[PDB]
Amino acid sequence: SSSLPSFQLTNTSTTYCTSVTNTGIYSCLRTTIQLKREFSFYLLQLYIPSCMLVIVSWVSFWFDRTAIPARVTLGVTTLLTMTAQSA
Amino acid sequence: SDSKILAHLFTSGYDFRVRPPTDNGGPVVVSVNMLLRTISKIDVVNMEYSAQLTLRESWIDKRLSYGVKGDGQPDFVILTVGHQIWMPDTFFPNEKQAYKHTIDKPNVLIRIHNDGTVLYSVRISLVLSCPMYLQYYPMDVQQCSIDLASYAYTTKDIEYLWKEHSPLQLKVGLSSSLPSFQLTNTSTTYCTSVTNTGIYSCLRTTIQLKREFSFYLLQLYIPSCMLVIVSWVSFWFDRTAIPARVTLGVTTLLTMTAQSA
Amino acid sequence: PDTFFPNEKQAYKHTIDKPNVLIRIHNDGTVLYSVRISLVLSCPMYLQYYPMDVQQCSIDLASYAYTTKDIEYLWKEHSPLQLKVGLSSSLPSFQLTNTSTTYCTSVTNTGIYSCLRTTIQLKREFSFYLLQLYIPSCMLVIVSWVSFWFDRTAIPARVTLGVTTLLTMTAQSA
Amino acid sequence: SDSKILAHLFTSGYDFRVRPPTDNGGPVVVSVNMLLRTISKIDVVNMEYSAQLTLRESWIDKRLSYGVKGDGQPDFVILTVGHQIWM
Amino acid sequence: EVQLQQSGPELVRPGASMKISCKASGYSFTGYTMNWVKQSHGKNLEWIGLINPYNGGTSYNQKFKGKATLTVDKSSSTAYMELLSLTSEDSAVYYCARDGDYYRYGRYFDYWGQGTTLTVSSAKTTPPSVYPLAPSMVTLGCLVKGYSGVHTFPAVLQSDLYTLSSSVTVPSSTWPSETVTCNVAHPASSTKVDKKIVP
Amino acid sequence: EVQLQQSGPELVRPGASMKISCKASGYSFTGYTMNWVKQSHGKNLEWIGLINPYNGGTSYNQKFKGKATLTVDKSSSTAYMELLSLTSEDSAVYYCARDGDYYRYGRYFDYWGQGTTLTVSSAKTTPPSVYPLAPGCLVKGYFPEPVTVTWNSGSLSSGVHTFPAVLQSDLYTLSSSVTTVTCNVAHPASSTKVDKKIVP
Amino acid sequence: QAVVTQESALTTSPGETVTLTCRSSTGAVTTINFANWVQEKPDHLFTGLIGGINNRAPGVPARFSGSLIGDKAALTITGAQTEDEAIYFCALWYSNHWVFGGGTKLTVLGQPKSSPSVTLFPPSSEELETNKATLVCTITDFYPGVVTVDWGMETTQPSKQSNNKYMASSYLTLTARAWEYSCQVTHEGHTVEKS
Amino acid sequence: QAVVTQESALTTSPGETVTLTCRSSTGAVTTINFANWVQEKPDHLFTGLIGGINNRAPGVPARFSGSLIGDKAALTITGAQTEDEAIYFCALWYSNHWVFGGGTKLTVLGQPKSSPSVTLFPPSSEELETNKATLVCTITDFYPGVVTVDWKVDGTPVTQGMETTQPSKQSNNKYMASSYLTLTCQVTHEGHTVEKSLS
Ligand SMILES: CC[C@H](C)[C@H]1O[C@]2(CC[C@@H]1C)C[C@@H]1C[C@@H](C/C=C(\C)[C@@H](O[C@H]3C[C@H](OC)[C@@H](O[C@H]4C[C@H](OC)[C@@H](O)[C@H](C)O4)[C@H](C)O3)[C@@H](C)/C=C/C=C3\CO[C@@H]4[C@H](O)C(C)=C[C@@H](C(=O)O1)[C@]34O)O2
Ligand SMILES: CC[C@H](C)[C@H]1O[C@]2(CC[C@@H]1C)C[C@@H]1C[C@@H](C/C=C(\C)[C@@H](O[C@H]3C[C@H](OC)[C@@H](O[C@H]4C[C@H](OC)[C@@H](O)[C@H](C)O4)[C@H](C)O3)[C@@H](C)/C=C/C=C3\CO[C@@H]4[C@H](O)C(C)=C[C@@H](C(=O)O1)[C@]34O)O2
Ligand SMILES: CC[C@H](C)[C@H]1O[C@]2(CC[C@@H]1C)C[C@@H]1C[C@@H](C/C=C(\C)[C@@H](O[C@H]3C[C@H](OC)[C@@H](O[C@H]4C[C@H](OC)[C@@H](O)[C@H](C)O4)[C@H](C)O3)[C@@H](C)/C=C/C=C3\CO[C@@H]4[C@H](O)C(C)=C[C@@H](C(=O)O1)[C@]34O)O2
Ligand SMILES: *[C@@H]1O[C@H](CO)[C@@H](O)[C@H](O)[C@H]1NC(C)=O
Ligand SMILES: *[C@@H]1O[C@H](CO)[C@@H](O)[C@H](O)[C@H]1NC(C)=O
Ligand SMILES: [Cl-]
């Protein structure tokens, strides 16, 4: 688990997968591990920064309606950045 | 002379499959020396590192003694091709990939001293797994290890021990081929363990790698301060020209994101 | 001679069709041995003057099992190191300025081993760094100056310039 | 001792190509143990993962029995190089 | 603090088999392998075998191969030891001793248990056979068999039974001029005998 | 400037063993391998062996295999040489000579030390027996060195030649010529200042 | 097979330096023997001291130290203490199992030494009638708690008294026909003997 | 085994070109002999000159040069200097060890040649009382400092019991030496010989 940083090996199972093929019936075992993806990374690199990005687009609701250049600059930069992040 | 001495040893009944005999039935004691040549490609994502070393094993095989006391004969005779000898079936438990060097003649050396003492030297390139801990990532220290142990022979047949004097040695041009880190400390230890197939003897060398800071100073810290400081120069623009302030504050914030990405 | 390359990290012999080797046994007992070998060697580099640096890479050759009493290497007396004519043309990024042929015999714990060492000196080509780094940065700094000619009243124009050129500067360095 | 026990087993007519005999003509039953050492490089794009394990197989081959009840001899003899065995 | 608490004392008849426990606490139970040591009156300490909690793996002293069976219950952090075909020779004190290293075999002992005393006997209650002993200050002896200066020594085990004596130094002028006697009681047998020490 | 300073002179009885040092300074100590050379009166220069400071590695002359043991202490930049089972034949001057190449064996000598003089003699502190040399003096059977000689209690100082001492009976012995007349000997190791007149 | 040998008992005063030794019968104690040292306080209290390569148990005082003096394993207590008085077992590792020694009884002096008061009792008539003869050699008032009985025999383990001078009893068992004698106690020097 | 041979001594004037040679007994000096040259000034001052393949020590003057003239190693001093007067040892490398030569005593002439003044003394009757006999043969005032001392007893040349000191610089820049004989004197210099005998 220490050499597996990105996931968490939650569960394992030991089963049979014997099958009938055209050349005959072959005996077969199957071990299965269950990997849960670690969330801390996606919290910090995806969710947090997107909220921080959406929240910025709101601070333009507090600029006077006369200074539209400021509003567009915000709304557009946050939208563009949003794109990049998703890419 | 040498060719004759070798002939004498193998003309009799000698079985390279049979473990060397002992006086008290004890295990064959294998002394180990290890020389690191280069430590490279320290992968943080897959948490592993590569390293090329020279393994050096030394045990006693009375069956191979020719000179005994000698003092009339050559101290040791070089083992030539075509002569089998029992050797510790050592492997590297934490090795994920491994190659022996065979350019031209294979890179090995086997000496059979008169008293029956055998020396074994071989170049080996390895790719070892090294679990890393990035809690202080920019300024961290990792500890990577190489484990060495027998595969088939248990604790009753074969026992590893680090050479008494300088068990681990480094080549002079190692730190120079390792630009990103600084090899601060090394240690030589035992990792013998009890498994379901038996109790196996095991050595473990450990190097300690300190991450070089100059890079992170210049590519991360400096430029971020320079970025935060820019967001401040908008405190000196008239409160009427907000377009200038937003342009600064937003560009520095966006850039901040990119940098972190 | 069980020669190997001490600083080789990877190595292959060429065996397409018949193996690429040649062995001659002259009448007097003199043996000639010729073999093609592809290598990947380690070459510690020093980037203090990175854009305009010179590195020196080497190939080390020595015996593995035989000590100084059994086998001794010596560079051929005349032209020990030769280069194929189409070498510099297959090396676009550097210029192979100088080569040297030396000895690196050393005393180890298993004995004293004879060793040769050839060294090539690589000078990094500048044309690339002139065009992709220096020129564009001057062109970038010079742009930040054209805002000194805009009226002090139109600050939006000045900030737009000064900030875009600064940001671009960052990207370029990255 | 061990070398002699091995010699005895293969001096007779033994064929590593021939499946081990059974009492009722049944199939050779192979018990399997599996030890995962490391699970790494979990590729989502190519949908595959790497893993290093220790396979452990165990079956009965009466032809190879030397000690039988034993209790005077070594419990097991390590198979040395140069001795073929049906696997 | 780490602690190894072993099961209480046990009394079992020959031919039977009992199992003693060693409950570990104060450390990651599965990280350290457990040894079992046998301390018998007849001999020194003997090493029975060891088990790796995490692994299930075991390794026995050739001597106890088939006499003892080491197991482990991860859930309860307990190590158990089975003892089969119990006999007279199995009557001893069994300790459990942890290995020193963390998730690896270090071949050195840390903490032991308080020990478990196992008594394997096939003899029923027997009355103490009292035999008097006798040769400034004269010392008199009293011998109990097959069951100032008051010195009762430890009790041996002769022929599957117990046996101890009893010294008693007194001024010679009080013997045989005065009746020296020694009381020998035995609650489990309900028998008290007297032996008059005579010259 | 590089310097190799070796330990002082030593006097030891046969059967014993002593160790001389060679403290290096003025260069990266671990980069150059050290040689040990033995210069004895009886023979020429002999090469004992060499040690690589960085490596620990050593290589001895078959002759001194077991007689000398080269070691090195990186911390103090010092090279040491053990000499076991000392005997008469071990009485010599031991130099240490650095190899020429930087982190590689060049097989050529750079700098030597001033040398260390080792004297192995089971001899007893003995005064000099002076005999007259007529047609010079003859300080004989004196140990340990040195011994000083004057003429006419110092007066006659012109044309006086005091020759090197020699080990002829395990005891040093030297003479001194000149061109009444008496020679004065003054052995400081036993406080012996005997004079012998020079008669026909 | 292989057998481990230790000093029967040793004596030392508070502050001094005592050394226990562990000897292998097959040969010299080497590193692959992983010489272990275990301490046993009264009431069956075992704890490890040294073992493995060159490691020690958690809490083992700095005065304890291991070494391979001569050709056997050693345990040196530099600056002995009162509490250091116990029984010390050393264990050697032979291939695949441990072999313990007899143990050394280290005594840290507290009371002046005392000679063993011995008394040898003959087999009474009741025993002779039984056809089994028993001898009793009672040992009282000695210190430290180390005595060696020398005459079928079976001596009991040293056990302190009310005056802190360990005591014990010896039993030489015979048959009435064999009956139809002397006990000597050697205690830290002289040898008290009676017939 | 293998032995290295050099000129006993050579002479040269300031500015001239002298050449020392080093000879191998096993055969011709090849490159794998790594012929080394060492200089020894008075008072035990050793320093390297040439060695290895074709490298030289730090500071070795340009006038010094190595070569393989004929079939032996050479050391040529082009433009000899006063200070160049010393003893030169050459060392050959044979497989795994060094073998030194006898050394060549190079003299840079800054003084007119001077024949040795040989005096032979008779063993004082004094020391004969010790039942021992010692002949002294003082040699003084010679240059260059390189003399051969050969003894003779009744025609036949002495083979045992002789010991001569190494020549040493005296006051007047000339050399001196002594030679002893052991019981119970001709001197070679620059070519000529000086004999002093006694009946
Ligand atoms: C707070 C978010 C809002 C949007 C604020 O965002 C900003 C400013 C605007 C808003 C006020 C910007 C934002 C940082 C935050 C400030 C946050 C911190 C200084 C740290 O985190 C806090 C909160 C965090 O818990 C959310 C908490 O962890 C706890 C609770 C968690 O469980 C909920 C649990 O899992 C965890 C184990 O323990 C922590 C201790 O402390 C710091 C860790 C945040 C770093 C953020 C980033 C680092 O690189 C990322 C990337 O390069 C990028 C593009 C944007 C960055 C960013 O997003 O920058 C980034 O994602 O403020
Ligand atoms: C000074 C920082 C502030 C924020 C200034 O930043 C700017 C302008 C605004 C501020 C005034 C911009 C900044 C450069 C600095 C000017 C800096 C230099 C010209 C050089 O460095 C100085 C300081 C440096 O010591 C901090 C010092 O090294 C010493 C001391 C150190 O110990 C503290 C020690 O380790 C070291 C070994 O020896 C050095 C000799 O000299 C130059 C080296 C800086 C280069 C910076 C960069 C190169 O590529 C980076 C990247 O492409 C990027 C995105 C931004 C660049 C940047 O960040 O550009 C960058 O990070 O000015
Ligand atoms: C002139 C520089 C200033 C800053 C001007 O820059 C700009 C506009 C603003 C300034 C006036 C922008 C700049 C181009 C220049 C115009 C340059 C050219 C049209 C060409 O080059 C000139 C000059 C050049 O000699 C400097 C000369 O080569 C000679 C002399 C050299 O020895 C000094 C010698 O080595 C050489 C062998 O023979 C050449 C024949 O002709 C053209 C070659 C330039 C291309 C530039 C670029 C191509 O991709 C680069 C990158 O994608 C980027 C990010 C920016 C580009 C740029 O930097 O664009 C870029 O680096 O003008
Ligand atoms: C693992 O356990 C989970 C528990 O919810 C269960 O759903 C699943 O069937 C198990 N299977 C595997 C492969 O681990
Ligand atoms: C190449 O050129 C110069 C000129 O002789 C020299 O200083 C340098 O050492 C040489 N480099 C190599 C690698 O041969
Ligand atoms: Cl913009």
GROMACS .gro file of C-alpha atoms in nm, chain C residues 40-154:
model
  115
  388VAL     CA    1   2.458   0.424  -2.366
  389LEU     CA    2   2.719   0.589  -2.147
  390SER     CA    3   2.680   0.814  -1.844
  391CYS     CA    4   2.827   1.161  -1.890
  392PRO     CA    5   2.805   1.392  -1.587
  393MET     CA    6   2.735   1.740  -1.721
  394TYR     CA    7   2.789   2.084  -1.571
  395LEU     CA    8   2.540   2.353  -1.669
  396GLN     CA    9   2.695   2.657  -1.499
  397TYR     CA   10   2.706   2.836  -1.835
  398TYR     CA   11   2.424   2.622  -1.978
  399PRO     CA   12   2.325   2.819  -2.288
  400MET     CA   13   2.693   2.851  -2.384
  401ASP     CA   14   2.856   2.546  -2.225
  402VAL     CA   15   3.097   2.269  -2.323
  403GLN     CA   16   3.062   1.915  -2.193
  404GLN     CA   17   3.318   1.635  -2.202
  405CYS     CA   18   3.189   1.283  -2.246
  406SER     CA   19   3.402   0.972  -2.218
  407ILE     CA   20   3.409   0.602  -2.295
  408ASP     CA   21   3.600   0.385  -2.050
  409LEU     CA   22   3.741   0.049  -2.151
  410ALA     CA   23   3.901  -0.203  -1.915
  411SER     CA   24   3.935  -0.571  -1.826
  412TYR     CA   25   3.693  -0.716  -1.570
  413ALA     CA   26   3.857  -1.030  -1.432
  414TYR     CA   27   4.219  -0.995  -1.539
  415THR     CA   28   4.437  -0.770  -1.326
  416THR     CA   29   4.749  -0.571  -1.413
  417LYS     CA   30   4.970  -0.880  -1.415
  418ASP     CA   31   4.771  -1.060  -1.684
  419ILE     CA   32   4.643  -0.793  -1.920
  420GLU     CA   33   4.750  -0.437  -1.998
  421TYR     CA   34   4.574  -0.196  -2.232
  422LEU     CA   35   4.751   0.056  -2.451
  423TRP     CA   36   4.609   0.288  -2.714
  424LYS     CA   37   4.726   0.213  -3.067
  425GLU     CA   38   5.037   0.417  -3.144
  426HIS     CA   39   4.896   0.588  -3.454
  427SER     CA   40   4.544   0.735  -3.461
  428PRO     CA   41   4.400   0.546  -3.161
  429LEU     CA   42   4.065   0.722  -3.196
  430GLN     CA   43   3.904   0.776  -3.536
  431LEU     CA   44   3.574   0.935  -3.635
  432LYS     CA   45   3.351   0.835  -3.925
  433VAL     CA   46   3.301   1.112  -4.179
  434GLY     CA   47   2.924   1.133  -4.127
  435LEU     CA   48   2.939   1.185  -3.750
  436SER     CA   49   2.913   1.562  -3.712
  437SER     CA   50   2.624   1.562  -3.961
  438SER     CA   51   2.429   1.320  -3.743
  439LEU     CA   52   2.499   1.549  -3.446
  440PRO     CA   53   2.300   1.867  -3.519
  441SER     CA   54   2.274   2.018  -3.170
  442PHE     CA   55   2.645   2.012  -3.082
  443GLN     CA   56   2.988   2.056  -3.239
  444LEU     CA   57   3.249   1.789  -3.162
  445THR     CA   58   3.543   2.026  -3.115
  446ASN     CA   59   3.812   1.809  -2.955
  447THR     CA   60   3.896   1.448  -2.869
  448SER     CA   61   4.156   1.290  -2.640
  449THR     CA   62   4.294   0.944  -2.572
  450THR     CA   63   4.399   0.871  -2.212
  451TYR     CA   64   4.454   0.608  -1.942
  452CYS     CA   65   4.233   0.557  -1.636
  453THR     CA   66   4.398   0.258  -1.468
  454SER     CA   67   4.286   0.244  -1.105
  455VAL     CA   68   4.357   0.054  -0.785
  456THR     CA   69   4.051  -0.122  -0.645
  457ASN     CA   70   3.983  -0.364  -0.360
  458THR     CA   71   4.006  -0.663  -0.593
  459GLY     CA   72   4.332  -0.540  -0.747
  460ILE     CA   73   4.489  -0.295  -0.992
  461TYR     CA   74   4.307  -0.289  -1.328
  462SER     CA   75   4.438  -0.139  -1.654
  463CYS     CA   76   4.199   0.101  -1.825
  464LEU     CA   77   4.177   0.328  -2.131
  465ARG     CA   78   3.957   0.634  -2.174
  466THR     CA   79   3.861   0.823  -2.486
  467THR     CA   80   3.707   1.169  -2.444
  468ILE     CA   81   3.506   1.384  -2.683
  469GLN     CA   82   3.437   1.752  -2.621
  470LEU     CA   83   3.092   1.880  -2.715
  471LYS     CA   84   3.026   2.251  -2.771
  472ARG     CA   85   2.657   2.342  -2.760
  473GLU     CA   86   2.525   2.511  -3.074
  474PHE     CA   87   2.421   2.871  -3.008
  475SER     CA   88   2.198   2.954  -3.307
  476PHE     CA   89   1.903   2.784  -3.139
  477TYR     CA   90   1.935   2.971  -2.811
  478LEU     CA   91   1.991   3.298  -2.995
  479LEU     CA   92   1.661   3.260  -3.182
  480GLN     CA   93   1.445   3.085  -2.921
  481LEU     CA   94   1.566   3.260  -2.607
  482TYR     CA   95   1.775   3.576  -2.642
  483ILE     CA   96   1.620   3.744  -2.946
  484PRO     CA   97   1.259   3.692  -2.832
  485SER     CA   98   1.340   3.819  -2.481
  486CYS     CA   99   1.493   4.140  -2.610
  487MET     CA  100   1.194   4.176  -2.840
  488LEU     CA  101   0.986   4.125  -2.525
  489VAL     CA  102   1.173   4.376  -2.308
  490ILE     CA  103   1.169   4.631  -2.590
  491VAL     CA  104   0.789   4.604  -2.607
  492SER     CA  105   0.761   4.691  -2.238
  493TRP     CA  106   0.934   5.019  -2.327
  494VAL     CA  107   0.685   5.135  -2.590
  495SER     CA  108   0.454   5.209  -2.298
  496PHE     CA  109   0.681   5.497  -2.195
  497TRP     CA  110   0.546   5.681  -2.498
  498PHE     CA  111   0.178   5.647  -2.411
  499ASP     CA  112   0.018   5.940  -2.228
  500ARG     CA  113   0.032   5.901  -1.849
  501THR     CA  114  -0.347   5.929  -1.849
  502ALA     CA  115  -0.404   5.606  -2.041
   0.00000   0.00000   0.00000
